[PDB]
Every structure is written in structure tokens, then in C-alpha cells.
């Protein structure tokens, strides 16, 4: 509350560390469904169904241009990529499986880097 603060957690490396995680996600072999925005003209249903599209290139551009106020807003966009993927793709599909693998990979890096 006013003039009463918890001790200051060092957040000065967050930007660099999120960038590194994102690099590692970008270069994973199952990243291909997530590298670029879904083409809303060529994928029937996507526009109407997926209210907030998100992809690694869009995250990268937001990260690079100071559009994440903190590391939690960065994690929310990454998770949004996987949550969108689960909404639109059957679990038993190459893309569905890619999404599950990537979410697992992300959450481990996230925990190991920050928790």
C-alpha cells in the first residue's frame, strides 16, 4: 500500500531473457505452425472463431518495440498462441500435437528461467 513496498525483484534482465526464450521457441522444429500469422483470407473459419490471433513473429515485433509492459504480458501472448491452436485444431493432428509440444517446452523454460 502507500509507502509500504515488498522488496524490489530484479527485472532488469527480463527483456533479454524473454528474447532468448522466444529464440528457442522460434528455432524448435515444431514451431512451423506458429512462426507467422495465420492467413485470414485463406483459412476458412479462423477470422470469426479466433478472436485474438497471435504468432511468434508478432510476439517478436511487440517485444522488440517495447509493447510488453512486463514479463507476464509476454507469457500471456505466448500462451495465447497455444490456446488458439487448441481451439482450432484436433489434438490428434500434426498441428495439434505441435501446439501441445511447444506449450510444454515453453512452460519448462519459463519455470527454469523465472521461478
UniProtKB/Swiss-Prot annotation:
This protein's name: Bromodomain adjacent to zinc finger domain protein 2B
Tissue spec. comment: Expressed at varying levels in several tissues, whereas a smaller transcript was expressed specifically in testis.
Annotated function: Regulatory subunit of the ATP-dependent BRF-1 and BRF-5 ISWI chromatin remodeling complexes, which form ordered nucleosome arrays on chromatin and facilitate access to DNA during DNA-templated processes such as DNA replication, transcription, and repair. Both complexes regulate the spacing of nucleosomes along the chromatin and have the ability to slide mononucleosomes to the center of a DNA template. The BRF-1 ISWI chromatin remodeling complex has a lower ATP hydrolysis rate than the BRF-5 ISWI chromatin remodeling complex.
Whole sequence portion shown: 2054 to 2166 of 2168
Compartment(s): Nucleus
Domain Bromo: 9-113
Family: Belongs to the WAL family.
Subunit structure comment from the entry: Component of the BRF-1 ISWI chromatin remodeling complex, at least composed of SMARCA1 and BAZ2B, which regulates the spacing of histone octamers on the DNA template to facilitate access to DNA. Within the BRF-1 ISWI chromatin remodeling complex interacts with SMARCA1; the interaction is direct. Component of the BRF-5 ISWI chromatin remodeling complex, at least composed of SMARCA5/SNF2H and BAZ2B, which regulates the spacing of histone octamers on the DNA template to facilitate access to DNA.
Amino acid at each position: 500500500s502507500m509507502s509500504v513496498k515488498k522488496p524490489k525483484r530484479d527485472d532488469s534482465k527480463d527483456l533479454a531473457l524473454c528474447s532468448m526464450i522466444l529464440t528457442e521457441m522460434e528455432t524448435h522444429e515444431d514451431a512451423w505452425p506458429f512462426l507467422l500469422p495465420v492467413n485470414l483470407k485463406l483459412v476458412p473459419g479462423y477470422k470469426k472463431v479466433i478472436k485474438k490471433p497471435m504468432d511468434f513473429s508478432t510476439i517478436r515485433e511487440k517485444l522488440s518495440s517495447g509493447q510488453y509492459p512486463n514479463l507476464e504480458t509476454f507469457a500471456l501472448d505466448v500462451r495465447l498462441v497455444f490456446d488458439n491452436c487448441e481451439t482450432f485444431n484436433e489434438d490428434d493432428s500434426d498441428i495439434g500435437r505441435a501446439g501441445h509440444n511447444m506449450r510444454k517446452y515453453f512452460e519448462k523454460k519459463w519455470t527454469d528461467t523465472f521461478k
